[PDB]
Design a protein around this ligand. Structure first.
Ligand SMILES: Cc1nc([C@](C)(O)CO)sc1-c1cnc(N)c(O[C@H](C)c2cc(F)ccc2N2NC=CN2)c1
Length: 270
């Protein structure tokens, strides 16, 4: 656990609420080492007056995050858990969540989306690198979706990096998870298929003509999402593999990264 002095942390502004207390955008001095300087951070807080049950759940979240070190996984830079309000200090992803990022790219102008196919393929590749890391660590995510991924830039020109953050969402859940409550790395592969469909559609809601409860049945009955408009067939083929009814027939995250990597190389050669 990376204990950090709260005296070196400034809470600058409110970003949202989340689940335990409030989430702020802040500044942490030398949180990377003694020379580092002032670096922009996001601070997850546990409201003062929280019960022991809430403190234990907050401690569990800090423990979970302390295990990740990957370019495509959100990093916990420090914790301030000795006093109230308790803090979990994270790297600030200035672009915000991927769902909002994708949606704004689509709706900014009728000339076209602010993201191209090669931008969207790079997003898929970057998330799949994160998933390969998680599979290698034996960490089951349970909630892969664009609303849980973050982008490093807010604009659509600068080089960007996407990271997996936030560790029922029926529209993202695998059949076994809906029927038996089974959550494995194979069910995460299902959600990854939904997330790449989110990317290629630029943040459209999965199964738009279905309700949450009709999604529960439609998915158990063999029904899948519609192919995104003009979606390259290699990406649609990969997506349908992710949605195999039986978890054992779905590809591994390492295979998915290879498939995305092959498509990106093939496409760039054209
Ligand atoms: C700067 C910034 N803007 C965001 C918006 C409001 O969603 C706009 O895209 S998230 C965000 C933002 C930037 N960097 C973070 N490290 C962050 O982490 C928080 C804990 C978070 C991580 C997630 F994976 C998903 C949602 C959230 N939020 N969102 C609100 C509270 N927690 C949020």
């Amino acid at each position: 656990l990376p204990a950090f002095p709260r005296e070196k942390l400034t809470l600058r502004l409110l970003l949202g609420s989340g689940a335990f207390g409030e989430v702020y955008e802040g500044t942490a001095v030398d949180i990377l080492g003694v020379g580092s300087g002032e670096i922009k951070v996001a601070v997850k807080t546990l409201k003062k007056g929280s019960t022991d049950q809430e403190k234990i759940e907050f401690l569990k979240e800090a423990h979970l995050m302390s295990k990740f070190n990957h370019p495509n996984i959100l990093k916990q830079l420090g914790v301030c858990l000795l006093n109230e309000p308790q803090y979990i200090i994270l790297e600030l992803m200035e672009g915000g969540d991927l769902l909002t990022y994708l949606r704004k790219a689509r709706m900014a102008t009728f000339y076209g989306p602010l993201l191209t196919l090669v931008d969207l393929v790079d997003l898929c590749v970057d998330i799949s690198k994160g998933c390969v890391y998680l599979e290698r660590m034996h960490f089951i995510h349970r909630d892969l979706a664009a609303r849980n991924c973050l982008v490093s830039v807010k604009d659509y020109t600068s080089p960007r990096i996407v990271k997996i953050g936030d560790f029922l969402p029926v529209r993202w859940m695998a059949p076994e998870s809906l029927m038996d409550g089974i959550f494995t790395t194979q069910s995460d592969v299902w959600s990854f298929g939904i997330l790449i469909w989110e990317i290629l559609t630029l943040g459209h809601q999965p199964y738009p003509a279905h309700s949450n409860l009709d999604v529960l049945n439609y998915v158990q009955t063999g029904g899948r999402l519609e192919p995104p408009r003009n979606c390259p067939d290699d990406l649609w083929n990969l997506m349908t593999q992710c949605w195999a009814q039986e978890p054992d027939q779905r590809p591994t995250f390492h295979r998915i990264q290879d498939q995305l990597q092959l498509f990106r190389n093939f496409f760039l050669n054209s």
